[PDB]
Design an enzyme around this catalytic site. Structure first.
Site, short mmCIF file in Angstrom:
data_model
loop_
_atom_site.label_atom_id
_atom_site.label_comp_id
_atom_site.label_asym_id
_atom_site.label_seq_id
_atom_site.Cartn_x
_atom_site.Cartn_y
_atom_site.Cartn_z
N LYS A 45 37.94 39.84 40.24
CA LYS A 45 37.28 41.08 39.82
C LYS A 45 38.28 42.02 39.15
O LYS A 45 39.49 41.90 39.31
CB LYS A 45 36.64 41.81 41.00
CG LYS A 45 37.60 42.34 42.05
CD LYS A 45 36.92 43.35 43.04
CE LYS A 45 36.22 44.48 42.33
NZ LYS A 45 37.23 45.53 42.10
N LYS A 75 44.99 40.55 38.65
CA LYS A 75 45.17 39.35 37.83
C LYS A 75 46.40 39.43 36.94
O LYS A 75 47.22 38.50 36.89
CB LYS A 75 43.93 39.10 36.98
CG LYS A 75 42.69 38.78 37.80
CD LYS A 75 41.49 38.48 36.92
CE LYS A 75 41.13 39.64 36.02
NZ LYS A 75 40.70 40.85 36.77
N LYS A 107 40.61 44.42 28.30
CA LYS A 107 41.61 45.45 28.53
C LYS A 107 42.89 45.17 27.74
O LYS A 107 43.59 46.11 27.34
CB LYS A 107 41.87 45.56 30.04
CG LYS A 107 42.67 46.76 30.47
CD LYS A 107 42.48 47.05 31.96
CE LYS A 107 43.33 48.25 32.43
NZ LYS A 107 44.73 47.87 32.79
N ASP A 161 34.26 39.61 36.47
CA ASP A 161 33.15 40.36 37.05
C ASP A 161 31.80 39.81 36.61
O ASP A 161 30.79 40.03 37.29
CB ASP A 161 33.26 41.83 36.65
CG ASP A 161 34.62 42.39 36.90
OD1 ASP A 161 34.89 42.82 38.04
OD2 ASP A 161 35.46 42.33 35.98
N1 ADP Z 1 51.02 43.37 44.99
C1 ADP Z 1 50.88 44.59 44.42
N2 ADP Z 1 51.51 45.68 44.92
C2 ADP Z 1 51.38 46.90 44.37
N3 ADP Z 1 50.60 47.16 43.30
C3 ADP Z 1 49.90 46.15 42.72
C4 ADP Z 1 50.01 44.79 43.26
N4 ADP Z 1 49.23 44.00 42.48
C5 ADP Z 1 48.66 44.79 41.54
N5 ADP Z 1 49.09 46.07 41.68
C6 ADP Z 1 48.67 47.20 40.84
O1 ADP Z 1 47.25 47.13 40.77
C7 ADP Z 1 46.84 47.61 39.48
C8 ADP Z 1 45.87 46.62 38.85
O2 ADP Z 1 46.48 45.33 38.70
P1 ADP Z 1 46.15 44.43 37.41
O3 ADP Z 1 47.00 43.19 37.53
O4 ADP Z 1 46.24 45.28 36.18
O5 ADP Z 1 44.60 44.08 37.72
P2 ADP Z 1 43.56 43.24 36.82
O6 ADP Z 1 44.40 42.57 35.73
O7 ADP Z 1 42.93 42.29 37.81
O8 ADP Z 1 42.57 44.22 36.24
C9 ADP Z 1 48.08 47.78 38.64
O9 ADP Z 1 48.43 49.17 38.59
C10 ADP Z 1 49.15 47.06 39.41
O10 ADP Z 1 50.42 47.66 39.23
MG MG Z 2 44.36 42.56 33.67
#
Ligand code: ADP
Ligand code: MG
Ligand code: ADP
Ligand code: SF4
Ligand code: SF4
Ligand code: MG
Lengths: 273, 273
Positions: B10, B15, B41, B129
């Site tokens: 999600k 990811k 994104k 999603d």
């Molecule tokens: N293990 C973790 N510890 C701290 N922050 C995290 C961790 N994994 C992800 N984040 C934070 O969560 C937010 C979303 O992560 P992201 O990888 O961009 O999600 P997605 O790609 O699934 O939309 C980012 O700000 C990232 O820095």
């Molecule tokens: Mg992403």
């Protein structure tokens, strides 16, 4: 007349909890409301109906033959406070377009006379991680004049709010779909209210309410109820009553001003979240 | 040969952070890797490239005239550890199908010879999603044989994992797309590891790694880096190294067994989250 409102936002942000509690408060106030679920998860009406979920128009049309073999009285179900509830449904994952059931459902409701004059509000609870297909239809086809976006200090939740706002701008030359406000569904972080107020101001709207994180929500939902029904004296019940009052009284409906990624990152940097 | 892996889950679950850190650890190990961003994104490669984001194939094709006027050397960019990076892009919100750029990008990469023999791994970072349109294409068209789903004890994150699994089952009669494991991206909650292990067992897979929540991620990303590059001695760097090692060594690739909503709710009830 009736006010047609849609609640958008990223998955998991609190659309269905916020919508059903808001609507319960409206019904407690004496308003007549219909909820139209526009998310394939299809649990947007369970707290009004005291149910696991609700069988969807897509599912019921398939068992009946065609959508024309369905009657409105077969599909709309009334729960707490007389709130009327319907779920669109959607195709199974990997098949078709995830939003195709929204188009079928809204057209069925319109044709079958569900928008009866004594309704005061309709709320569409819409998946907002993508703005396309049936999920864009409430905006593209002028079904929801007032968009309220549930978000939080989470960057992805604010990104989604900006993305939905871009879709509103894209269709501003036709119909009358407008952004009515942001609803902050708290992650219990510091200055989060100030962060969402600042985002709303940049977009040209307002934070209509800050909803606190409160465990009474989980205790109510385990029992398939809104907080309004489960514990009418709860502090959180008064929060949803405040949100409902401000939605009723809101007159600010704008064509929003989407912001750049640099502006978003500056907001998070500044408010130190 | 090369292993073609896709990371689903999600929005906001982690990811892109998990994928880029995993891939950096693989490059540190001596593997040659390409990342293909399949999320609108379009920030799935920024930590490898030290960048704001990356201009997308959709954007570059529009400025060049057609996708045929693009050369692979114009679109693929190399960053940390020689990892090669490309972003699909997608239409603006409210216009078209949000996943249409994924189809254009994967076909362009295949035709232009991006899948050169010396690659060891390709990772697709895919919005999860909804499982439709271009977002379903890596599964439907047999592009990613190994699906790893990032999730957490959040009900919506587990729901998404089940939904993606249903899409894998739907296409099991063709190609060879399989579920390779769940990656728990911790919300710092109790028994969360045990919860995701239990979910993986019910689906027929495994929890390949539990990634802790650690603020060093934010400190690295503010500087546009992976933790692997930013602070190679960090505990969190060793966590991503453990995840990378287990992905390399993983031999369990299954047709998953999706569960009912009652099973999901029983899991959360039982583990008291
Ligand atoms: N293990 C973790 N510890 C701290 N922050 C995290 C961790 N994994 C992800 N984040 C934070 O969560 C937010 C979303 O992560 P992201 O990888 O961009 O999600 P997605 O790609 O699934 O939309 C980012 O700000 C990232 O820095
Ligand atoms: Mg992403
Ligand atoms: N203000 C709140 N306090 C506590 N829990 C909340 C609150 N709002 C939402 N939740 C919980 O968050 C989860 C997701 O909310 P939901 O309304 O289902 O999200 P969405 O409909 O946007 O996918 C639910 O378990 C819900 O109980
Ligand atoms: S994104 Fe779902 S079908 Fe276009
Ligand atoms: S969901 Fe996006 S276009 Fe079908
Ligand atoms: Mg919902």
């Amino acid at each position: 007349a009736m006010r047609q409102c849609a609640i958008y936002g990223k998955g998991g942000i609190g659309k269905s909890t916020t919508t059903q509690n808001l609507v319960a408060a409206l019904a407690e106030m004496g308003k007549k409301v219909m909820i139209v679920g526009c998310d394939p998860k299809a649990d947007s009406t369970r707290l009004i109906l005291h149910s696991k979920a609700q069988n969807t128009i897509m599912e019921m049309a398939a068992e009946a033959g065609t959508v024309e073999d369905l009657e409105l009285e077969d599909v709309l179900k009334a729960g707490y406070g007389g709130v009327k509830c319907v779920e669109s449904g959607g195709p199974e994952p990997g098949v078709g377009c995830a939003g195709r059931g929204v188009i079928t459902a809204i057209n069925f409701l319109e044709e079958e006379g569900a928008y009866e004059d004594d309704l005061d509000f309709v709320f569409y609870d819409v998946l907002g991680d993508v703005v396309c297909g049936g999920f864009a239809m409430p905006i593209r086809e002028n079904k929801a004049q007032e968009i309220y976006i549930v978000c939080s200090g989470e960057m992805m939740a604010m990104y989604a709010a900006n993305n939905i706002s871009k879709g509103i701008v894209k269709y501003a030359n036709s119909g009358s779909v407008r952004l009515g406000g942001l609803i902050c569904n708290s992650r219990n972080t510091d200055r989060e209210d100030e962060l969402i107020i600042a985002l709303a101001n940049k977009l040209g709207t307002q934070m209509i309410h800050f909803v606190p994180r409160d465990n009474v929500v989980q205790r109510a939902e385990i029992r398939r109820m809104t907080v309004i029904e489960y514990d009418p004296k709860a502090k959180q019940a008064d929060e949803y009553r405040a949100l409902a009052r401000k939605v009723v009284d809101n007159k600010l409906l704008v064509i929003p001003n989407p912001i750049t990624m640099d502006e978003l990152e500056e907001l998070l940097m500044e408010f130190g979240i």
